[PDB]
Every structure is written in structure tokens, then in C-alpha cells.
């Protein structure tokens, strides 16, 4: 292809870096529909591309706050939990080694003096 898509792949044509073509095979593999157009696989990658970048971007900020360079499963949970919109998308799931965000309740921490309210004697 002198002017056709030999040089430019399907993913690069739409500006994406995700496989796109592998997704197109997945629709046929999963038998989601009898016929699949060209718009479907590229669109699915586009949702993944922004979701892939945004979650890593939010997690990447946690690594700097955590005094670490490489992203660990702890930061993946932190990025998801911090964003309330991400909670609706996912959060009824289990993340391997994700950890739990601090959720201390106000019923604990007896800020008032541990001595009795009436007098010093317990």
C-alpha cells in the first residue's frame, strides 16, 4: 500500500495506542453481535485509553505522596477510593493487596478527659 494503511496501523489512524485490532477480535470471540462495524473496536479502546491513563495518573500522584516511585497495589486502591465517581464505576470488587483507606469514626477517640465527667474519680 503506497498510500493505504500499511505504514499506519488501525490504532495509529485513530490516534490511540491500545491494540484496537485485538479488541476487534474479542468482539468476534465473545459473540457479542452478529456483525461488528469499524466504530465499535476503536471506541472501546478509546474508553479504555482514558480510563487507563486517568487511573494511573491519580495513582501516580499517590506514589509521590507515599514517597515511592513504582506504583504498588496500595496506590491503585487509593486512586479509586479517593475519587467518588470512580467508586460508582468500581468498588464492589476486591483489589489484590489494595488495602483500605483510613475511615476512623468519631465515636472512638475520647477527646474529652478520660476522668469522669462529674469528678476526677473514675
Amino acid at each position: 500500500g503506497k498510500t493505504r494503511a500499511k505504514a499506519k496501523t488501525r490504532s495509529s489512524r485513530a490516534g490511540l495506542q491500545f491494540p484496537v485490532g485485538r479488541v476487534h477480535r474479542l468482539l468476534r470471540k465473545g459473540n457479542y453481535a452478529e456483525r461488528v462495524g469499524a466504530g465499535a473496536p476503536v471506541y472501546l479502546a478509546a474508553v479504555l485509553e482514558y480510563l487507563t491513563a486517568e487511573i494511573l495518573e491519580l495513582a501516580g500522584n499517590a506514589a509521590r505522596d507515599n514517597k515511592k516511585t513504582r506504583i504498588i497495589p496500595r496506590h491503585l486502591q487509593l486512586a479509586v477510593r479517593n475519587d467518588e465517581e470512580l467508586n460508582k464505576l468500581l468498588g464492589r470488587v476486591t483489589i489484590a493487596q489494595g488495602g483500605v483507606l483510613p475511615n476512623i469514626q468519631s465515636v472512638l477517640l475520647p477527646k474529652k478527659t478520660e476522668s469522669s465527667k462529674s469528678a476526677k474519680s473514675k
Binding site: 470488587v93 476486591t94 489484590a96 493487596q97 483500605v100 475511615n103 469514626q105 472512638l108
Partner: protein, 102 residues
């Protein structure tokens, strides 16, 4: 390097293999194991009856998950669950797992 027949299981048993009845093992989840889980939630104190109930809750949860994974296991005819039957069992029960598989 095949050196015998296993069939149902316990290949080349004789007197070289070892096995135990394993009557009760839910007691392995003791006070420190339950307390650590409670600390993640934010619990201050835990009652005595909760420790046995926590074991009971774990027993029911494991029983529900395994029966789903066992069904997929016989379909593939494998004698062991590797990574996916647990994931598929967790997916169907609303406990979908990310990582360790898929």
C-alpha cells in the same frame, strides 16, 4: 517423569506418602487473625461470641465460593483449580477479583 498410576489420587502411596483426617481447621483463624480484620474496619473491641461467629461467617463464605468453582472444575475435567475457576466463582457472587488472574 511418570513412574506409576494415580487414578483417583494418592499415586505411589504405599508407606511413602502422608495424609491426615483434618477434622476441624476453622479454628486456625484465632483471635489475632480476627482482630486484624476488625482493625481494618475500625473496630475498638470484639466480643467473645463474635470470634466463633467470624469463623462461621468465613465457613459459609468459603462454602458458597467453592461450590461455584467446583462446578467449573468438573467441566474442564481438571483435578485442581489454577486461577480462573476461583475468579469465575467470585465474579458470579459479586466478589470479582482484580489481579492474581485474568
Amino acid at each position: 517423569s511418570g513412574r506409576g498410576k494415580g487414578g483417583k489420587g494418592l499415586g505411589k502411596g504405599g508407606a511413602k506418602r502422608h495424609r491426615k483426617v483434618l477434622r476441624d481447621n476453622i479454628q486456625g483463624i484465632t483471635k489475632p487473625a480476627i482482630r486484624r480484620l476488625a482493625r481494618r474496619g475500625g473496630v475498638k473491641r470484639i466480643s467473645g461470641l463474635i470470634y466463633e461467629e467470624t469463623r462461621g461467617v468465613l465457613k459459609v463464605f468459603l462454602e458458597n465460593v467453592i461450590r461455584d468453582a467446583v462446578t467449573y472444575t468438573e467441566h474442564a475435567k481438571r483435578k485442581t483449580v489454577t486461577a480462573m475457576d476461583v475468579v469465575y466463582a467470585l465474579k458470579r457472587q459479586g466478589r470479582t477479583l482484580y489481579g492474581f488472574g485474568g
